[PDB]
Amino acid sequence: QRTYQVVVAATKEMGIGKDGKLPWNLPTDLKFFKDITLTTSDSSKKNAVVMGRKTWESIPIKYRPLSGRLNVVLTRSGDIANTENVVTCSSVDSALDLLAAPPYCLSIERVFVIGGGDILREALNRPSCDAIHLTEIDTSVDCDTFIPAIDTSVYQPWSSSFPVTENGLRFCFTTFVRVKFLFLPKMVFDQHEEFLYLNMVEDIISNGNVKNDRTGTGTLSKFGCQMKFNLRRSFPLLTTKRVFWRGVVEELLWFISGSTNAKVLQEKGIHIWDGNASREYLDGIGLTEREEGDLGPVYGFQWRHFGAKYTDMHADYTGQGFDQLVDVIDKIKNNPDDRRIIMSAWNPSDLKLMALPPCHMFAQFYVAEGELSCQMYQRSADMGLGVPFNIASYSLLTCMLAHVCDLVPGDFIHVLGDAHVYKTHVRPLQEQLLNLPKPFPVMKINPEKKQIDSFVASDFDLTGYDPHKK
Amino acid sequence: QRTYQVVVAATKEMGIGKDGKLPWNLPTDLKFFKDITLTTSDSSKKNAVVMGRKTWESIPIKYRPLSGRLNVVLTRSGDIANTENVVTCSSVDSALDLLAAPPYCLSIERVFVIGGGDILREALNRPSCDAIHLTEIDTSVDCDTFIPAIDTSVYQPWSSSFPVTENGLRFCFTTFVRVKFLFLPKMVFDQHEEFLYLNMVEDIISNGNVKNDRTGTGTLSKFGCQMKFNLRRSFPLLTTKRVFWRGVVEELLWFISGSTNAKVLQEKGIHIWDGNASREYLDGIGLTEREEGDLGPVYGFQWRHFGAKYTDMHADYTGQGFDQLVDVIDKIKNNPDDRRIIMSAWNPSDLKLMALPPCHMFAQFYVAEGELSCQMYQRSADMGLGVPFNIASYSLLTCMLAHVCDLVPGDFIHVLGDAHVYKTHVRPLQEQLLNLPKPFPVMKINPEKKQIDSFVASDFDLTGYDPHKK
Amino acid sequence: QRTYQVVVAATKEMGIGKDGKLPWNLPTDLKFFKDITLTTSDSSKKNAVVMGRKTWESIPIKYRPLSGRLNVVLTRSGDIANTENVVTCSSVDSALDLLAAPPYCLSIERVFVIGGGDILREALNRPSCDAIHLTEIDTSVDCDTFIPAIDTSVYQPWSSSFPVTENGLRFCFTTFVRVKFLFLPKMVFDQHEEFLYLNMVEDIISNGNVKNDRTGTGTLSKFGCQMKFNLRRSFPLLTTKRVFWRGVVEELLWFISGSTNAKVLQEKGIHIWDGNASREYLDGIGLTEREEGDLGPVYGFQWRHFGAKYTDMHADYTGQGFDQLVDVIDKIKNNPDDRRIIMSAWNPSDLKLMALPPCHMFAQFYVAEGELSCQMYQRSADMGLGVPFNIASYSLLTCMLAHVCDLVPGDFIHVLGDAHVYKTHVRPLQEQLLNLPKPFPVMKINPEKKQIDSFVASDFDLTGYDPHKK
Amino acid sequence: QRTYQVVVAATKEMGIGKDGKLPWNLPTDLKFFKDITLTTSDSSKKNAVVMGRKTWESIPIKYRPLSGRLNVVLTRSGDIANTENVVTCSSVDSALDLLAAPPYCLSIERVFVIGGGDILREALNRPSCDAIHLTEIDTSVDCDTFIPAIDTSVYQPWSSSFPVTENGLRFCFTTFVRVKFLFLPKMVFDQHEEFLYLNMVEDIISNGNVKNDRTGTGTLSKFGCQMKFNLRRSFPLLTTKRVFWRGVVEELLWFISGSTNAKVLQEKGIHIWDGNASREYLDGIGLTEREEGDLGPVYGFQWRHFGAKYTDMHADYTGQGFDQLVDVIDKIKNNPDDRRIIMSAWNPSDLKLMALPPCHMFAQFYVAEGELSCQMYQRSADMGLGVPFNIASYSLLTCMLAHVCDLVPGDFIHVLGDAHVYKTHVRPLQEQLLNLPKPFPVMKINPEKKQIDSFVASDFDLTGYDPHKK
C-alpha cells in the first residue's frame, strides 16, 4: 500500500469552496499545484493525482484529464471511462493498493491526494499521509466546505514561503511533514532554510580567502553575506548540530535587563562570557583596575543607556543615556512605518572600556501586514559557533518584540561582514554538512507576559527540536 | 562579411602559452570556454569557432573537432579533411566571407575567434571584433607567446566576474565590448551589474508592501535587500538614467572635510542639502535657534569627531571626539585583517540636533588579495533617486580609500533596510526599465594625490559615461 | 507593423462554436494550440497571442492569462487591467503597431491571432497573415459561428498531419503559408515531408556502405528504408530539384494501357526508356531477335496480362493472363477491407524476356475512412534520379485509383530495398541539400473522367509547382 | 557493497591499448562513453566512475576530473588530492564499500568501472558486475593490453547497435547483462528491440482504424509499418510471450523442402496448417476434389518451382519451374552486390488453386561487410499471433542462408501492409504489454551442415530463452 501527500488551498477559517467554486483566483497557486503534482525526479516516471468525482467534474471539460499525471478518480455510481491517463477506484484504500502493484509500482514516482472536501476529511490525518502542501490564504471570505485543522501533534512545518499578494489576496505555501524526509519533492526538500546556512559554510570553505593573525590562528573568509529566515511557521534553531538554546534565552534576557555583569550568567550556569571577564583576560588587554566579570559598557548598557558615562557594573544608570529598546518598542506600537526603528551597540567613544567590542552591532525593525521583521548587521561572523547562536538570538528578540507589541513575527535577515571558518573547524564542519536538516522546531511565548522586562526562561516553549548528535 | 568575438585566457604580462602548452590548469575557464562557444539563443542553430592550424593540432586528437560547433581551421599548406563539423579556409577574411553565405547565413548564430597567437594578433583589434571575452589570470609565470593589450580607446568593460581561485591561481572573466550590445551571448549580456538595480526596482513595484504616512504620501516597499558591485574593471554609475556624478564627488569631499555647513555645497552649485537647511525647514522641525545651512552634527561631524559636543557649524572641533576616517585608514594600512574597520554616522545622543538623521548609517571595510571592499548599510532607500547616488558615493569612497592606502578597489556591497519606490515614481521608473544598460564608465584617480584630505573634483576622471536621456 | 499567423480549430462546414462553447473536446488540439503559441526558438523571448474580448472571457477565470505568452486582448468599452502579461489594444492594426515597438520589438518572437469569430473574419485573409494553422475537424455538428474558407489563390499547404481520432472525432493539423517560409515555427517548418527524402539522402551519403560492380561504377548504399507521404492536402512532387512530371504522367498512362512499346513514349517526346530499348542495348543483353523498342513483358504487360505467353509488343493479348489493375479496382470498390489488394510486376518466369527487370516490383492498397492508401516496394532505389520520379508516379497512381473508385487519397508509403547514391552524384546532391523546400503543389484530376483507361495528360492539373533551379 | 557496470572499447582480438595510447580515434564512442557515465534518471543525483591510476593519468591534464561525475581513482603509492569531485580508494572492494555509505548512498545513482587493463581483468567477470557496455571494434590493429573474453555462461546480450563507420573503422555498442534488468541506464534499457514490437502493438490498439467483415469479426488496423531487428548478437524470439520456436523451425524446413503436404507437419506434431487443410475447410472454399492436406501451390512450391503447372502434393516437380531458393543462394555466393536477390510466393495465376494465398509474400536479400540482411513484405499481419512467429521465421531463414553462404547474419527488416489486432485480443495483449522484455536468446547453427536441404531441427541451438508465462 503506497503513501501519499496532500495538496490543498484553504482560507484562515480552513475553507476550500464557496458554491462548488473557489472564492479566489490565484494563478501563482495554480502554477504551484501544477509544478508539485506534474514534475518528477525521474524524467521517465510520472505522478498519480487521486481525486473525488466532485473534484474530477469541477475541472473544465477541456483540461481533463490533468496532463502529465495518472488521474485516479474515486467513484460510487453503484459512469467514467478508464484510459492510459484515467483510472476509476472504489476507495482511497483501493487506489493506494493499485499503485503499489505493477505497472504503477515502477511507473508512479509519488502519489498526491488533491480533494475534494469528502476525500480530504479522510486523507488529511491518516498515518499514510507523509506530508501536507497547504496554500494558506489570508482571507475570511465565506466558504461552505472546510477541512480539519492540520494535527500539529503529528505534523511539523518543513518550509513556508515568503508571503505573496495576487488579485487582492495575501497567501503563502507551507509544507508540513509527518513526524529521512526524502519522500518530499526535491523542490520542497531544498526549501528548508537551514540549507541557506549549510550552502554558505560550503561556499566559504570552498572559495573563502585564506588569512592569518599575530598568534598564528588561520581562517577562510568571505565578505558581505545575507541569509533570510521565515519566523512565521517555525523557529530557525539549527538541526544539523545542537544550538545552545538555553544560553541564547539567558544571554538575551541579560542584554534586555541592561546588565554588563558576566557573573549574572555564571550564577545561572551560562559560561559563554567567562573567557572575556576573567582576571587573566582583563589584565591581558590592560583593564587591570576592572573587577572580574565587569565587561564594561557592552550590549546591555548600549541598548538601555547609550551615551551615559560608564563607571562600573554595580552603578544605577536609571534615567542616564538613551534607552534604545524602549524607543524601538514605542515606534513599533505608535509609528510602525518609521524608517529609523534601530537599536545599536556601536559606540566608538566607549570601545576602549569594553572587554570585547560589539560584534552584532546594529538591528533595524520593519512592520507590514501585522508582522515584525528584523535585519541585523554582524561585523564578524564565525560560521561554526557564533552564527547559529546569533540567528537564534535575534530571531528570539524579533519574536519577543512582536509579542509585547501585539504583532506576529515576519522575517529575520542576517547580514554578515567578515564571515569566516577557522582552518581547525573545516574537518568537523564537513562532517556536519553530511547531516540532512530535520524540520525546525516551533517556539511559543507565554501569552500572560506583555512587558519586555517581565520574561523568564520558562516563558519560551520549544516543541519538536531534535538535532543531529554532537 | 560576418562579425566575431574573441575568447582568450591570458596572464598579467598578457601571455597565452609556455612551450606550445598552457602554464596553468583551470577547469572553471575550460567550462566557461565550452559554455560561451557551444550554447546558442536558438536550440536549432549553432556557433562557429575559428582557429589557427597550431590551435587545431594543440587539441588532443580524441576531442577533435570541438563538438556542437562548426570548427573553421585557417590553413596554409601551399592537409586536413572537410566534414559536416570541419571547414578549412585560407584567411580570417575568407572564413568570415563563407559564414555570411548559405547555408551558414542561417545555420551559424555567432562566430568566435579562439587563437592561436598569430590569428589573435590580427583579430583582437579589428573593427569587426564586436567583443573580447578575456580570462584574466593573476600570475607572472613565464610565457613565450603574447597578444596585444586590449585597446581601451575602442573597447570598454561590460562585465567582470568575482575573482575565483583554482589550482593555486586567482583569475576572473572580463567581457569588453566595442564602442545595442545585443550581439553579446545572453548569459554575458545578463551579467551587467546594472540589472541588479533594475531587477530590484521591478521586484519592489511588483511585490512591495503598500504603505502611507501623515501627509498622504504613498510607497511600495521591501525590507532587507543586498546588491554587490564589482569595482575592479568599471565604476557603477547607472546608465539607464543619468546620475548626478558632480554632486556625488562634491558631497563626498564635503563629508571627508568634516563640514556640516550646507552653504559650502550651495556656493559650488550643489543644492541637494538645500531643502534640509532652509530657515523654513529648520523652523518646521523646531530648530528655530539654528542658522540657515547649519545641518547640525550630521555625516561629516560623526565621521571626523564622533562623540564631541556640537555647538555650531563654525566651531573648530580639532582634537575633539573620535576620528573614524583616520582610524579606518590606519587599520587598512597597518592591520588590514582587522574585523572592526568601521565608520558610522549613527549617534543616538545627537539625533535631536540633526537637520536629518543619517540614512547611510554605517560602512565596514575588508582587505584580501590587495583589494579593498566596502559594505554599507542604508536604513531607508528611495530606489528612484537616493539609491543610484549612494551606490556611486560609497563606490567612490572605496576607490579613494584604496588609492590613499596603496591598494586596488574590490567590491561595494549595498545593504538596504526599508527599500521603497514612491507611488508617484512608478510610471517614470517603468519607462526607465525599458532602457537597456550601456557599459559602465571607467574611473581613474590622480596618482599625485596620496592623502584623504587633499582631493578636489578634478582628481576624478570618468571615461565613457553616456547614459540614456532625461 | 509586425506580421502574424492564425491558429484556429474548425468543422468541415468551417464552424468554430456552438452556443459560445466548442461542440467538441480534443485534448490533442489543446496541446497543439499550447505548443505552437507558447514555444520559441529563443528560450529568452516569448510569443504574443492576440484575441477578442469574447475569446478572453471564454477562457475559464483560473487559467487567465494564457501563461508563458504576452496576451493582447482587443477591446471596445467606449474594463480590463493591463499587467506584465496582459495588454489591451483598440484594433488588430494597433496591436501590430505596438508589438513592432520597444520593448516588444525584441521581447516578442512571433505573433499569433487566435480569435474569436469577429477578429478571424478580418485577420484570416489579410496580407500580413504569413500562415494559417488550421485544425480540420471531420464533423458536421451544428455551429453558429463560421470563418471564411482559406483563400487557396494566396495560401498553399505546407504540411498536414496523419489524421487522429479522439473522443469520437477524426481531425488533422494543416499549416498553410502565404505565397523563405522561415517565419514558420521550427516544429512546423520541419514537418515538410520533403525532409523525409532529404534526411534519407544525407543518411546514405554519411553512413551508406561503399560498393562497386564489374564496370568500375561506385555507390553508397543502405538497405530497408521507408518514407510516408500524405496525399490529402498536397502532392509530393519534390521542390529542391525539378521532377520530370510530364514523363511521370505519360509513363503511368503507358503502364495502365498495358503497352510494352517504348516507341509510344518516344513519339510523345518521352525518352526515359530509350536507353533500354535501343538496337545496341538489346544486342548487348543477347536479345538480337527483339525489335527496337520491344521491352518484352515489363510493367504494362504484367499489370494487365500477368501469366500470359509474351510474343512481341504488337500482339493483341485481350483476355490473356490475369488483369491485376481491373482486380485492384474491383476490390477497392466492392471489397475495400480485403488484405490482398495487390498489383505486382514480379514474374520470375518472364525475367529472361524483359529488357530490364521490374524495380518497383509490387504495390498493396488499403481503404479506411473513405481514403485510399498505397505501399510500394522498390528493390533498387537510385536516390538522385529514380526515387523522386517513383514517389510522384505511385502518388499519381493512388490519386487516379481513388478518383475512379469514388474515394479520396490517403498516404503513399515508399519501401526501399537497396537504396543508393552514385559516388559521382554526391557533389550535386550536397548542393541540392542546401535548398530549403517550397510548399508542395496541389494536384486536381478532371471530374468528368471515371474509368482507368480514359485519362490523358490534360486531365491532371498541378498548381503552385515552383522548384529550385537546375 | 554497491554493484557496478563496465564501460570499455576493445578490438576483435579484445585489445584495449597500443603503447599507453588508443590505436583508434572514434568520437562516436567518446560521446557514448560520456552519455552513459554522465546522464542520470534523477537530475539531482550523479554517477561514480571508478578507474586505475594509469587510466586517471592517461586523461589529458585539462579535462581532469571527468566533469559531472564522482571520479574514484584506485591508488597504491605505499600522491593525488581528494576534492568534491575526486576520491582515492585502496581497492575496487573499498570503493564499492565507500559508495554504499552516506553521503554517496543517496548521492550516487550508478557506478561504472572504466579501466584500465589491471582493474578490468578483476572487475569484468565478478558477480557484482550487473552489466558490460562493450564498444566492439572491427579491427586487428596491434594491441599490447587485452581483457578477458566476456563469460557468455553468465552474461547475455541485451542490445547491440546498428554498426557504424568512423575514421576508417567499423564498430558497434553491445550491452551484456548478468543472468529486473532495471539496473540498466534508461537509454540502454529502451534499446531492447522487443519494444519495437510492443510500441507497435500499443500504437495499433490506441490509434488503429476500426473495421469489420462478413462474419462479424472486428479489428483495429494500421497500414505501412516497419520493424528492424539486429541478428548479429542475439535472435529476436519474443520474451513477453512464448513463441512456438519448434513450429517455426519445422515449418521453415518444410518450406525449404518444397512440400505442400500439411500431413508432413501433422506427422511431426505441428498443427498450424491443419485448419487450412481439413476436408471441411477445402470443401468450404470450393476445392471439393482436393485431398485432405493438399494446400495447393503454396510457399514451398512457389519457392522451389515458381511457374510450374501444379497437379497434386504427390507429383515429382523436379526440373519444373524456377528454383528461387537456389537462385538466391547462387547470387549471395557469386554476385553478392546484385539488387535482385529476391524470393517470392506471389503468383496471381496460382491463387485460385491455393488453400490460402501467401501472406509473407516476398523477401529481398542484401550483402555488405560480410553480413547477410533480409527485408520481408507481409501483406496481412496479425500482431498477436502471426507477427512474432514470422519475425522468428525470416530471422531463421536469414541465419540459415548466411550459414550455407559462409557469411554472418546482419539485420531482418519486417515490412507490414495491413497490420491488425483482433478486438478480442486487445485484453490479453494489454496484459502482455505489462511484461518487461528479458534478453533475447542466442541461436547457433551446426557448423557441419553446409547445404540448404540438409538441415534438421537438432541443427538449431537456442540458449537463454526464458519467456514470461502463458
Please give the DSSP secondary-structure letter assigned to residue D28: H
Interface of A with B in 381-400 (CB under 8 A): none
Q: Which of C364, C368, C355, C370 is nearest to C397 (CA)?
A: C364
Strand partners, B86: B71
Q: Which of C394, C438, C468 is nearest to C157 (CA)?
A: C438
Which residues, in sequence order, are CB contacts of D22 under 8 Å at separation 6+? B62, D9
Q: Give how far the C-alpha of residue D168 lies from the chain's centroid of Cα atoms, to the nearest Å.
A: 26
Residue with cell 484562515: A12
CB atoms closer than 10 angstroms to residue D122: 14
CA dihedral A237, A238, A244, A250 (to 10 degrees): -20
Helix D245-257 and helix D386-404: axis angle, to 10°? 60
Q: Which of A439, A441, A399 is nearest to A159 (CA)?
A: A439
Q: Would you say D155 and D176 are in contact if contact means Cβ atoms under 8 Å apart?
A: yes
Which residues, in sequence order, are CB contacts of A145 under 8 Å at separation 6+? A15, A16, A17, A116, A117
d(CA D428, CA D426): 6
Q: From the list D357, D375, D417, which residue is nearest C364 (CB)?
A: D417
Considering the candidates D172, D359, D374, D405, report the single residue annotated as catalytic: D359
Q: Which of D114, D110, D152, D118 is nearest to D133 (CA)?
A: D114
End-to-end Cα separation, chain B, in angstroms: 37
CB atoms closer than 10 angstroms to residue C89: 17
CA dihedral C296, C302, C303, C308 (to 10 degrees): 110
d(CA B301, CA B261): 10
d(CA C456, CA B339): 98
Q: Give how far the C-alpha of residue A424 lies from the chain's centroid of Cα atoms, to the nearest Å.
A: 29
Check A22 against C62: CB less than 8 A apart. Answer: yes
CB neighbour class for D168 (10 Å; exposed up to 12, middle 13-18, buried from 19)? exposed
Please give the DSSP secondary-structure letter assigned to residue A452: G
Helix D194-207 and helix D386-404: axis angle, to 10°? 150
Chains that touch A (3 or more CB pairs under 8 A): B, C, D
Q: Return the SS3 of D169.
A: strand
The phi, psi pair for C420, rounded to 5°, reads -135, 155
Q: Would you say D413 and D397 are in contact if contact means Cβ atoms under 8 Å apart?
A: no
Strand partners, C380: C418
The β-bridge relationship of strands A460-463 and A442-445 is antiparallel
Helix A386-404 and helix A324-334: axis angle, to 10°? 50
- For residue A212, the chain B residues in CB contact (below 8 A) are 337
Strand partners, C173: C135
Strand partners, D70: D48
Q: Is B86 annotated as a binding residue?
A: no
- B235: cell is 565604476
Q: Would you say A372 and A409 are in contact if contact means Cβ atoms under 8 Å apart?
A: yes
- D209: cell is 482504424
CB neighbour class for A263 (10 Å; exposed up to 12, middle 13-18, buried from 19)? middle
- CA distances, B415 to each of A415, B359, D55 (Å): 8, 12, 50
- Written as one letter, the residue type at C359 is C
Q: Would you say A157 and A28 are in contact if contact means Cβ atoms under 8 Å apart?
A: no
CA dihedral A6, A11, A15, A16 (to 10 degrees): -50
d(CA B284, CA B279): 9
Q: Which of C239, C34, C1, C9 is nearest to C129 (CA)?
A: C1
Q: Which of B433, B428, B355, B365 is nearest to B399 (CA)?
A: B365
Residue with cell 583582437: B124
Q: Would you say A459 and A446 are in contact if contact means Cβ atoms under 8 Å apart?
A: yes
Q: Give how far the C-alpha of residue C168 lies from the chain's centroid of Cα atoms, to the nearest Å.
A: 26
- B453: cell is 584630505
Q: What angle do CA C402, C403, C404 make, to 5 degrees?
A: 95
Select from D22, D29, D62 the residue whose CB has the most chain B CBs within 10 Å, as the one to mutate to test that interface.
D62
d(CA C92, CA A90): 52
- A228: cell is 533570510
Q: Is B239 annotated as a binding residue?
A: no
Q: Would you say D219 and D211 are in contact if contact means Cβ atoms under 8 Å apart?
A: yes
Q: Which residue of C has its CA nearest to B436?
A: C103
Q: From the list B228, B324, B348, which residue is nearest A306 (CB)?
A: B348
CB atoms closer than 10 angstroms to residue C410: 25
Q: Return the SS3 of B158.
A: strand
d(CA A156, CA B4): 57
Which CATH number is A193-463 given? 3.30.572.10
Beta strands of A319-370 (E only): which ranges? Answer: 342-344, 360-368
Beta strands of D271-359 (E only): which ranges? Answer: 342-344
CB neighbour class for B400 (10 Å; exposed up to 12, middle 13-18, buried from 19)? buried
- Written as one letter, the residue type at A151 is D
The β-bridge relationship of strands C155-160 and C169-178 is antiparallel
d(CA D99, CA A435): 16
d(CA B387, CA B396): 14
Q: Would you say A73 and A88 are in contact if contact means Cβ atoms under 8 Å apart?
A: yes
- For residue A223, the chain B residues in CB contact (below 8 A) are 366, 368, 373, 375, 410-411, 413
Q: Which residue of C has its CA nearest to D360?
A: C340
d(CA A254, CA A268): 11
- CA distances, D211 to each of C139, D83, D225 (Å): 19, 65, 18
Which residues, in sequence order, are CB contacts of D345 under 8 Å at separation 6+? D298, D299, D302, D303, D358, D360, D361, D362
Which residues, in sequence order, are CB contacts of D425 under 8 Å at separation 6+? D383, D384
HEC string of A287-332 equals: CCCCCCCECCCCHHHHHHHECCCCCCCCCCCCCCCECHHHHHHHHH
Q: Return the SS3 of B232.
A: coil
Chains that touch B (3 or more CB pairs under 8 A): A, C, D
Q: Return the SS3 of C460.
A: strand
Q: Is D149 annotated as a binding residue?
A: no
Q: CA-based Rg of chain D, rounded to a whole angstrom?
A: 27
Strand partners, A306: A322
d(CA B246, CA B244): 6
Q: Write the residues followed by a gap in chain A (C–N more than 2.5 A).
A: 78, 179
Strand partners, B376: B363, B414
Q: Is A29 annotated as a binding residue?
A: yes
Is residue B206 less than 8 Å (CB to CB) from chain C? yes
Which residues, in sequence order, are CB contacts of C464 under 8 Å at separation 6+? C156, C179, C439, C441, C442
Q: Return the SS3 of D355.
A: coil
Q: Would you say A221 and A410 are in contact if contact means Cβ atoms under 8 Å apart?
A: no
Smallest Cα distance from C322 to chain D, Å: 7
Experimental technique behind these coordinates:
X-ray
HEC string of A150-211 equals: CCCCCEEEEEECCCEEECCEEEEEEEEEECCCCCCCHHHHCCCCHHHHHHHHHHHHHHCEEE
Check A362 against B361: CB less than 8 A apart. Answer: yes
Which residues, in sequence order, are CB contacts of C427 under 8 Å at separation 6+? none
Please give the DSSP secondary-structure letter assigned to residue B381: E
Check A337 against B226: CB less than 8 A apart. Answer: no
Check C307 against D415: CB less than 8 A apart. Answer: no
Smallest Cα distance from B438 to chain C, Å: 16
d(CA C411, CA C365): 10
Q: Would you say C249 and C393 are in contact if contact means Cβ atoms under 8 Å apart?
A: no
Considering the candidates C129, C359, C374, C399, report the single residue annotated as catalytic: C359
Q: Would you say C199 and C222 are in contact if contact means Cβ atoms under 8 Å apart?
A: no
Q: Would you say B345 and B303 are in contact if contact means Cβ atoms under 8 Å apart?
A: yes
Residue with cell 529542391: C240
Query: Can D359 be counted among the known catalytic residues?
Result: yes
Check C417 against D357: CB less than 8 A apart. Answer: no
- CA distances, A101 to each of A4, A97, D163, D186 (Å): 15, 7, 39, 21
Q: Would you say A108 and A47 are in contact if contact means Cβ atoms under 8 Å apart?
A: yes
Helix B386-404 and helix B194-207: axis angle, to 10°? 150
The β-bridge relationship of strands C70-74 and C46-52 is parallel
Residue with cell 551579467: B191
Q: Return the SS3 of A268.
A: coil
The phi, psi pair for B289, rounded to 5°, reads -80, -30
Return the sign of the alpha-carbon dihedral for residues D90, D93, D95, D97: negative
Residue with cell 559636543: B309
Percentages of chain B per state (helix, strand, coil), in multiples of 5: 30, 30, 40
Is residue D186 less than 8 Å (CB to CB) from chain A? yes
- B438: cell is 550601456
Q: Would you say C392 and C272 are in contact if contact means Cβ atoms under 8 Å apart?
A: no
Q: CA-based Rg of chain A, rounded to a whole angstrom?
A: 27
> DSSP labels for A77-138?
-------SSEEEES-HHHHHHHHTSTTHHHHEEEEEE---HHHHHHHTTSTTEEEEEEEEEE
| Resolution as reported, in Å | 2.0
Q: Which of C129, C140, C119 is nearest to C73 (CA)?
A: C119
* Residue C130: HSE in the Cβ half-sphere, 13 Å Cα cutoff: 15
d(CA C374, CA C343): 11
Q: Would you say A282 and A292 are in contact if contact means Cβ atoms under 8 Å apart?
A: yes
End-to-end Cα separation, chain A, in angstroms: 37
Is residue B81 less than 8 Å (CB to CB) from chain D? no
Q: From the list D42, D182, D434, which residue is nearest A103 (CB)?
A: D434
Q: Would you say C41 and C178 are in contact if contact means Cβ atoms under 8 Å apart?
A: no
- B415: cell is 545593504
Q: Would you say D258 and D305 are in contact if contact means Cβ atoms under 8 Å apart?
A: yes
Q: Would you say C270 and C251 are in contact if contact means Cβ atoms under 8 Å apart?
A: yes
Q: Would you say D418 and D208 are in contact if contact means Cβ atoms under 8 Å apart?
A: no
